[PDB]
């Protein structure tokens, strides 16, 4: 009689009205220690008219450029960058390099109330539910340091736990990855992954064979409003910053001058 | 190709190093309300010498039998259960068919100490980390419901959030099914689940296919102390057990009796 198959079919036409009242970005996420609720990554991160998106990055040093920012308090620059209007935070983990800390991003998430990005270097489902865990609301995927199958399965893996993931590419071969592997967010990254050289056209050349369905970040040599209006005139929904607030004093002036 | 390179190189080392600190297993069930910190499943159900190990079961009703319990208290039910020893609970949450509730896995994990196991009928990694949510150390998966290639995902999206997986086998291909997955834990079922027929004698077939290395259940109609201690000679490690006690009057003192 078939029991099992009926039971199946059941289960499946419940499990879509399930998803409709608790998608799977609340899910997982609700269980993170936001203030209040999860918020929609995709919505902070669209442009609708001209207004100025930017992802605010906590960011002590780099690996070019050393130590930006000697006096750094991870907690004290998310609240002036959520008071000066960032769309999101973007949050550096990596500690050996850039000087960040996953606990960074604990300690942010329980006072800012704006999506976080754990900006790391991920290439494992472990990383990925750390980010969960830890309470980032989308994560860092590096399409250079990827084959297709992995960006896809780690793409995959984070949608299943309610995260996004901004994909980082640096040129054509790139895009044809994370287009491939369903990127939702592409971040167009003017600095070379190897030699730290800056091609400032970048965005250019790849926004015309990016599809209509994606938001599009652009990162790296921000620091100057006139080129940010010049960069969504090309189609540039938000811009991911870090450097040109940290090596100033006041990180939320330097971020407010610019919307 | 230099620093990229480099950064992910130490950022692996780093992994390994953290995953022994803070395993899979403990870093997603953490996200869970166990009143303490979450049981290992593996060593919950491992036989180490003759000990009578039950995974005791918390069902209302079932597709074959109607309502087997009209006073149902599930959390009554679950207590008395650990409190007889049980080796792991089941907690039912499929509603139509057998009238259990997602919810009552949370209710049962806020107030138990032994391993619970979501038993549904899964074939979505929503479902998945709706069990890590709501409490669940482990998960059930229907061999005979999936293809090879998806019971492996879903095995693999469960062992991501840190749950175990009972694969449930009805025949030699449900096994061949379970070993391309990956499985541990391998449960035998008596019952077939599209007619509801009985075959007693499927563990003397099965298990000697079966790596006695795994974790080997034996599921249904299992209702006598003399038969568990042939089952153990025959190398299962532990017992999955519901109508029987359900039908009884104290389904704890049914349990204590089969040890
Ligand atoms: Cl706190
Ligand atoms: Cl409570
Ligand atoms: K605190
Ligand atoms: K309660």
Redesign the interface.
Same mark, same amino acid.
């Given at each position: 009689?078939?029991?099992?198959?009926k039971?199946?079919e059941?289960?499946?036409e *419940?499990?879509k009205e399930?998803?409709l009242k608790l998608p799977?970005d609340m899910?997982?996420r609700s269980?993170a220690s936001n203030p209040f609720f999860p918020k929609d990554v995709i919505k902070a991160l669209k442009r609708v008219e001209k207004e100025v998106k930017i992802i605010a990055e906590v960011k002590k040093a780099s690996?070019?450029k050393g130590v930006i920012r000697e006096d750094f308090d991870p907690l004290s620059i998310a609240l002036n960058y959520e008071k000066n209007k960032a769309a999101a935070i973007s949050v550096l983990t990596?500690?050996?390099?850039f000087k960040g800390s996953l606990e960074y991003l604990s300690l942010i998430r329980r006072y800012t109330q704006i999506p976080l990005l754990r900006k790391?270097?991920i290439? *494992?489902?472990?990383?990925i539910?750390?980010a969960l865990?830890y309470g980032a609301d989308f994560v860092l995927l590096?399409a250079?340091?990827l084959s297709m199958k992995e960006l896809k399965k780690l793409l995959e893996?984070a949608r299943?736990?309610?995260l996004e993931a901004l994909v980082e590419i640096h040129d054509k071969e790139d895009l044809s990855k994370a287009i491939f592997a369903g990127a939702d967010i592409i971040g167009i990254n003017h600095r070379n992954?190897? *030699?730290?050289t800056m091609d400032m056209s970048l965005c250019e050349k790849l926004i015309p064979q990016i599809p209509n369905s994606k938001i599009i970040i652009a990162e790296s040599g921000l620091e100057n409003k006139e080129f940010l209006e010049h960069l969504q005139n090309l189609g540039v929904d938000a811009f991911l910053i870090g450097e040109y607030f940290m090596r100033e004093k006041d990180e939320g002036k330097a971020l407010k001058a610019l919307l």
């Open positions: 009689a078939m029991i099992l198959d039971i199946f059941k289960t499946k *419940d499990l399930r998803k799977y899910l997982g269980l690996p070019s990596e500690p050996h390099f790391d270097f290439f *494992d489902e472990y990383q539910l750390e865990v590096i250079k340091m893996f299943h736990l309610g992954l190897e *030699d730290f």
